[PDB]
Design a protein around this ligand. Structure first.
Ligand code: HEM
Ligand code: HEM
Ligand SMILES: Cc1cc(N)nc(CCc2cncc(CCc3cc(C)cc(N)n3)c2)c1
Ligand SMILES: Cc1cc(N)nc(CCc2cncc(CCc3cc(C)cc(N)n3)c2)c1
Ligand SMILES: Cc1cc(N)nc(CCc2cncc(CCc3cc(C)cc(N)n3)c2)c1
Ligand SMILES: Cc1cc(N)nc(CCc2cncc(CCc3cc(C)cc(N)n3)c2)c1
Ligand SMILES: OC[C@@H](O)[C@@H](O)[C@H](O)[C@H](O)CO
Ligand SMILES: [Cl-]
Ligand SMILES: [Cl-]
Ligand SMILES: [Zn+2]
Ligand SMILES: [Zn+2]
Ligand SMILES: [Zn+2]
Lengths: 411, 407
């Protein structure tokens, strides 16, 4: 079967065949689309087909499909699964697997970069202290004094589900949030629950607006342990505006390194429950989402006040005007400090070139429009009028529930 | 099977049961989501009529009543005999309002029950259609105090006698390919404009020429009519702060009126059913003015603002976009022509959606269309999960008639 997608701006039509390789389900049916829903211990039996599907893909990618080496590897994995109920990936397979999980990540606008991913193999890690060292090293490598490099660190795979490695933080670097007795929040409201957990575990909170959270790390299914990332490894950018000299006095800053630490990496049916990965920011992630969501730093009003915009009616578009200036300040600030950042026009233009290339060379590029279109100025970016098809390819990154909900406390 | 929708901003969770009444297909499967794709007999007719009449009688608290049964009986007899049936005026009005209520792509549905329905099923000729449409335009326009309206022409019979408005909207601007290679006017309307000239329209050849209506009655070849110029309310676009903005020579029309969709009620198909409301400002200032394939005015505005256009990261496009949208709203408000900004409209839609969940068990909604084309995440619909599904009565896309009509 062939599926067509049209671009309503250019009239360019593309043909998707890659969707035939999709396995997992979307949440949608013939009767209902769940495209805007955010969230719509394997046996041997189910494991070997998943392993074989992966190894076939890997050997095809290296132009060794059906070779003795391919056949020998299938046999080797078969025997390992029948004997030990699981198997280990070769380092080459692990690298290929992590790169493809990114390539397949339908919500990621940054995928033009997918083949440039540094993979740190942490499968020899056994303790939380060991995890801490690996993570510090990832942060230092990825930060590279502001010349950001994409990276992923991969800890040991799931075994029986009672020995999982987990990073309890949602991102490696993120700011604390503190709910006050008067119902206001100091710092980042997104992180109040996790901050309370850290405090309960023994973290001495500075209780300021931009306190870098400690790492809370679980190895081999043990209770998690707290570690502070060395402050000298955490690159941050004070936010200022190129024309408005008062912008700096809002006291805003953000960290340079976006590093997702709460997702599960699936490769050939194996599950890597701790696999922190990082790239660099698109400006709107900070300037729109983190600063301007009502449940985040929520700075729109203050900014608009200082610009002396007419705030008596929404039709003056004061919110829109303030939002653009905030986003200008974020890009200006990162660029001035020589910290890698991409604006939403550049990122979406590059994504469309990536997507078209993937259609030609791969037969498709699964993409989630809801997440791919930036959260401001949508229609003036080239992804808005691009039709997309969303489907699930493996290897993949998957959502997992926060570990405080599932963890069995040992004491 | 019962479904939850969460708002990620307010944590409020709503439960949808209405989707279980959904009938038509979405285009998605368990394997693939097509949520961002724009276009994803006597035997057949009675179940559809019954489904509709059942919902109608339930709405007036008379389900299972003698009047309910009698009407079902009457409609059955009429279908068995004539291969179709006619709606009562009450049923026609109910069906039209519910087609709007069910329109998953419409952010304006808080207004759904306040729709003026003009029954034009007695219309027989294209000149008759012209008169009805002029009256609709005048009523809806109401000297700038716009009122929602729909005008419903005769239903489809054998499909060889369709009523159709060939225009995509009742009021829209012509587009003309230039010897230059450039396009003058609205590039969206180049093909339809050519058809109009081919059918004998004397084109003025300007940037904002209101297109004539091409009306098709009873399956006949369409005929040309000009809307009286004095019935077409337009707004010149100026800016409250930038004196030079007026010098761009921009204007737009006050009345947004869709004329190319098919209204389905109780299995009956109304192929000509122009309907109109009032604008949300981004429709003009973002879509019509700034789409690359439309009037595409971003560069000119940015230049007049003297922004740094050397690099995308100055956000010059975003700055000019906001200013264009400020000018659209200011202009309509100053001339006392109804318009709603995207903050106000989306706030209203959220309130509407909560009402619909509580009173009706759900509200089908297409997030891709509901979220405004600028400043998405600062509006309350962005963080609102929505379920998209198809309920009838409905408005449906139908192919442009020149691809279909046999002359
Ligand atoms: C190199 C620069 C990168 C940029 C500019 C970028 C950009 C983004 C953005 C803007 C989002 C959506 C966030 C939002 O809508 O608020 C996203 C999501 C995501 N990206 Fe990337 N990305 C990059 C690198 C990476 C890397 C290295 C990986 C993995 C190796 C990755 C995998 C993902 C995944 C799995 C998601 C969905 C996350 C979730 O569900 O929470 N991206 N990306
Ligand atoms: C009264 C004020 C109204 C407002 C502010 C409004 C708003 C809108 C907007 C902004 C869109 C999408 C346009 C875009 O995304 O570029 C839309 C679509 C739509 N609306 Fe409304 N609307 C109104 C009245 C109506 C009425 C009166 C009806 C029918 C009786 C209607 C039915 C529809 C339908 C069927 C669509 C999808 C059209 C298509 O597929 O092309 N709306 N509405
Ligand atoms: C409920 C829920 C589900 C889900 N799949 N993801 C989330 C978190 C969404 C999220 C929020 N802030 C930040 C991110 C990171 C996106 C991101 C990731 C990377 C690697 C680089 C980059 N520039 N940006 C993701 C929440
Ligand atoms: C666990 C959790 C709870 C909560 N209340 N909110 C969140 C964050 C939800 C959230 C808010 N803004 C942005 C995002 C990023 C994902 C995202 C979501 C949507 C709808 C569009 C888009 N472009 N990107 C996520 C997470
Ligand atoms: C290929 C295609 C499919 C489809 N379903 N609709 C379209 C037209 C989209 C479209 C473009 N401009 C304008 C509209 C009208 C939207 C609209 C309608 C009404 C009644 C009021 C209001 N404020 N706005 C719709 C095109
Ligand atoms: C027949 C036809 C052909 C063509 N090439 N373009 C069009 C216009 C396409 C178009 C462009 N921008 C906007 C719309 C309105 C519908 C719309 C679409 C989306 C994706 C989001 C949103 N908020 N609203 C429609 C129509
Ligand atoms: O305070 C805890 C939250 O940060 C956490 O629940 C995140 O929202 C979650 O991990 C999703 O990324
Ligand atoms: Cl956001
Ligand atoms: Cl648009
Ligand atoms: Zn879907
Ligand atoms: Zn947000
Ligand atoms: Zn558009």
């Amino acid at each position: 079967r062939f599926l067509k997608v049209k671009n309503w701006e250019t009239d360019v039509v593309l043909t998707d065949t890659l969707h035939l390789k999709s396995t997992l389900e979307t949440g949608c049916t013939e009767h209902i689309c769940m495209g805007s829903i955010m969230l719509p211990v394997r046996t041997k039996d189910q494991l070997f087909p998943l392993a074989k599907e992966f190894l076939d893909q890997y050997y095809s990618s290296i132009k060794r499909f059906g070779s003795k080496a391919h056949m020998d590897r299938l046999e080797e994995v078969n025997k390992e699964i029948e004997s030990t109920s699981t198997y280990q990936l070769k380092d080459t397979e692990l690298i290929y697997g992590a790169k493809h999980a990114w390539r397949n990540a339908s919500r990621c606008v940054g995928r033009i970069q997918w083949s440039k991913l540094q993979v740190f193999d942490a499968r020899d890690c056994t303790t939380a202290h060991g995890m801490f060292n690996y993570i510090c090293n990832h942060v230092k490598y990825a930060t590279n004094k502001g010349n950001l490099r994409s990276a992923i660190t991969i800890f040991p795979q799931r075994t029986d589900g009672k020995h999982d490695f987990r990073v309890w933080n949602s991102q490696l670097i993120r700011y604390a949030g503190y709910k006050q007795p008067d119902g206001s929040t100091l710092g980042d409201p997104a992180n109040v629950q996790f901050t309370e957990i850290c405090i309960q575990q023994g973290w001495k909170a500075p209780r300021g607006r931009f306190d870098v959270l400690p790492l809370l790390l679980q190895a081999n299914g043990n209770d998690p342990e707290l570690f502070q990332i060395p402050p000298e490894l955490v690159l941050e950018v004070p936010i200022r505006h190129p024309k408005f000299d008062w912008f700096k006095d809002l006291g805003l800053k953000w960290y340079g390194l976006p590093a997702v630490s709460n997702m599960l990496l699936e490769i050939g049916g194996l599950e890597f429950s701790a696999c922190p990965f990082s790239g660099w920011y698109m400006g709107t992630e900070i300037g729109v989402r983190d600063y301007c969501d009502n449940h985040r730093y929520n700075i729109l009003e203050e900014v608009a006040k200082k610009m002396d915009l007419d705030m008596r009616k929404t039709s003056s578009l004061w919110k829109d005007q303030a939002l653009v200036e905030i986003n200008i300040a974020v890009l200006y600030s990162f660029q001035s400090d020589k910290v890698t950042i991409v604006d939403h026009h550049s990122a979406t233009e590059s994504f469309i070139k990536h997507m078209e290339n993937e259609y030609r060379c791969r037969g498709g590029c699964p993409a989630d429009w809801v997440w791919i279109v930036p959260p401001m100025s949508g229609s003036i970016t080239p992804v808005f009028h691009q039709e997309m098809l969303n489907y699930r390819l493996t290897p993949s990154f998957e959502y997992q529930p926060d570990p405080w909900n599932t963890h069995v406390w040992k004491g």
